[PDB]
Design an enzyme around this catalytic site. Structure first.
Site, short mmCIF file in Angstrom:
data_model
loop_
_atom_site.label_atom_id
_atom_site.label_comp_id
_atom_site.label_asym_id
_atom_site.label_seq_id
_atom_site.Cartn_x
_atom_site.Cartn_y
_atom_site.Cartn_z
N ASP C 15 0.84 -1.20 0.00
CA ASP C 15 0.00 0.00 0.00
C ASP C 15 0.87 1.25 0.00
O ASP C 15 2.09 1.16 -0.10
CB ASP C 15 -0.97 0.01 1.20
CG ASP C 15 -0.27 -0.18 2.54
OD1 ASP C 15 0.85 0.35 2.73
OD2 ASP C 15 -0.85 -0.85 3.41
N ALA C 16 0.25 2.42 0.13
CA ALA C 16 0.98 3.69 0.07
C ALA C 16 1.98 3.84 1.22
O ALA C 16 2.90 4.66 1.14
CB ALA C 16 0.00 4.85 0.07
#
Ligand SMILES: CC(C)(COP(=O)(O)OP(=O)(O)OC[C@H]1O[C@@H](n2cnc3c(N)ncnc32)[C@H](O)[C@@H]1OP(=O)(O)O)[C@@H](O)C(=O)NCCC(=O)NCCS
Ligand SMILES: CC(C)(COP(=O)(O)OP(=O)(O)OC[C@H]1O[C@@H](n2cnc3c(N)ncnc32)[C@H](O)[C@@H]1OP(=O)(O)O)[C@@H](O)C(=O)NCCC(=O)NCCS
Lengths: 129, 134, 129, 130
Positions: C15-16
């Protein structure tokens, strides 16, 4: 030169249609590209630690035939064209019977993350391919 | 061909992002799928219901062109038109814009109507043809 | 008896934050259970014809340390409990340095996939376990 | 206070078994927590201004009944406990007929995206919730 990467189909990849979700193929293709790079000594986030990354610019996928749960697939990957900042991967997927399930042409552009501006290709990669 | 543009909002969540800090490129593909589904739903058709009637829609060919990235918590609009219609299939033209109406990317999708349990092309249900007749 | 299953982290799983999304671990665990069963000749697309399935009834995951892109992980899986209709998987994920990333206890019930009703476990599964 | 968040089930969420893949529920739960915080103006932007990130420490999901394609679900979310550097989410999922499909208890730790060690809950957050 052709690179081969096996992929097992799991529940996560399938949908209610009884087949592999069409976007899961896209992920499979990415792993194949990743593993091909690794086969030529590349690691994509220690490679983004040096701020160099790859993003997909354009993708065309043709779905000729479905994959199903626990099918052992083979993803086949080639670099067919090279420019200053971009790469063209020609890829395809076959099953255990060598049936051509689908194929893709992926335009990948070399950028670096914190800017994501088109950066010139790393000199080592040019030498490899 | 009913030209009317169908709009569908999509919020970008953590699950859609990658380590690059932007939306994973396969997530865009799902977003497009959602909008096509919602467009069908808006015209009163359920794919879950169609499944038991041995009617399914599968992607035959898809071209996606990524122009600009989406990021966490962005509110996007997926735009969906039917541009071509044939006996067993039809063509979707789709695109994604953000809050500033920046064109993030666009897709052309060839969808084929099939009998899911034999996976062979079949004529579009008459009522679906009727809805998108013009 | 313990069963080990190797898993590579790809972009799709991150994810980010730059680490593996916590739901991707859940998918990893499912793979291991599937591969564990396969190792004992229990394939699940084969048995869906046979109208028998394993659905998760309860899952508890505890998270300790993160995994990152291109990490090679190991999913460790063992069946610790068994009853007429259900069974419990005890699982954990370690990285290359044998650091414990997380662990899970998964309760799985044997059901019929049509009406989704609890059936008794096949006497062959209780045999080889 | 209870926060409701609608979630539509799509093909991406389903598997070959004809029901929602059990991991897809985990993502649904996160969206709801995200939207719950957003309702109280605690957007990711607001969190980053506090330099605060939320990671899941422990999660127990209970799967009672399956969701299917085209189901319009409702995620119900509430914070039941708050301590020094953590707080506990109680979450449920029901279908259009309010049948309880599954529920979760989620321990969330307040960390610091630099490093991800325990960080005291923001004053505004502990004051916003009780
Ligand atoms: C949609 C579909 C039923 C179309 O059937 P079709 O009338 O044969 O369509 P096409 O002829 O254009 O298919 C192209 C080729 O794939 C072949 N093909 C179609 N279904 C096949 C199958 N189940 N197994 C092996 N080959 C198949 C076709 O024979 C054709 O061969 P050719 O062009 O080399 O002569 C079929 O292409 C298909 O199942 N595609 C996969 C759909 C999918 O899984 N999408 C992702 C999930 S949404
Ligand atoms: C890949 C990329 C750096 C291409 O660089 P480029 O210098 O813009 O080269 P292109 O000529 O192909 O640009 C294509 C179009 O996208 C536009 N574009 C690129 N970055 C943009 C941005 N950050 N905001 C708005 N538009 C942007 C460009 O303006 C161009 O449109 P135009 O005809 O009006 O000029 C950029 O287009 C991009 O970031 N695409 C999205 C990549 C992505 O997120 N993939 C999914 C994850 S892998």
């Amino acid at each position: 030169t052709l690179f081969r990467w096996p992929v097992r189909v799991y529940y996560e990849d399938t949908d209610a249609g009884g087949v592999v979700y069409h976007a899961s193929y896209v992920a499979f293709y990415e792993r194949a590209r990743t593993e091909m790079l690794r086969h030529h000594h590349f690691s994509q986030q220690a490679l983004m630690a040096e701020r160099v990354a790859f993003v997909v610019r354009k993708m065309t996928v043709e779905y000729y035939a479905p994959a199903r749960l626990d099918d052992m697939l083979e993803i086949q990957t080639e670099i067919t064209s090279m420019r200053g900042t971009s790469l063209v991967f020609t890829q395809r997927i076959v099953n255990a019977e060598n049936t051509l399930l689908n194929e893709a042409e992926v335009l990948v552009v070399c950028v670096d993350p914190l800017k994501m501006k088109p950066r010139a290709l790393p000199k080592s990669i040019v030498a490899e391919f």
